[PDB]
Design a protein around this ligand. Structure first.
Ligand SMILES: [K+]
Ligand SMILES: [K+]
Ligand SMILES: [Mn+2]
Ligand SMILES: [Mn+2]
Length: 134
RNA sequence: ACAU
DNA sequence: CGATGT
């Protein structure tokens, strides 16, 4: 219905898919960038969308914030709900780093708790998510 | 189809 | 136009 402005928005950016992956999180209300992940040489859009949500969860928990997270990724929202990133990306030497991070993110989800609502950003009604990469 |  | 996903 209405945008919850008191929230954190996250998004992936890539150069190719699979390709170089990065992500960031921004204050939905002000656009202030609150965190940015160093580019990862090879990953998928959905792995990056997933890591962005999990980093958001850790970021808000450390600061004792009950704000929700917005993501535009139907896939990544489901993966976080399941605490399982069902990526098809080949596990080999050159994907080793992204899979390490995905594996460590699942591990964090499986050893911590949170109440953070993870909400679908309704791009069709509201434009691109505020964390988008132009 | 939907979401990227 | 291709790829990642449910
Ligand atoms: K973009
Ligand atoms: K498709
Ligand atoms: Mn996105
Ligand atoms: Mn985007």
């Amino acid at each position: 219905e209405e945008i919850i402005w008191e929230s954190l928005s996250v998004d992936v950016g890539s150069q190719g898919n699979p390709g170089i992956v990065e992500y960031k999180g921004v204050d939905t209300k002000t656009g202030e960038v609150l965190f940015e992940r160093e580019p990862i040489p090879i990953g998928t859009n959905n792995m990056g969308e997933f890591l962005a949500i999990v980093h958001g969860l850790r970021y808000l928990k450390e600061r004792n914030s009950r704000k929700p997270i917005y993501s535009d990724s139907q896939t990544a929202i489901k993966w976080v709900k399941d605490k399982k990133a069902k990526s098809t990306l080949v596990r080999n030497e050159e994907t080793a780093l992204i899979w390490k991070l995905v594996d460590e993110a699942e591990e964090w989800l499986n050893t911590h708790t949170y109440e953070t609502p993870i909400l679908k950003w309704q791009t069709d009604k509201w434009g691109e998510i505020k964390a988008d990469y132009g």
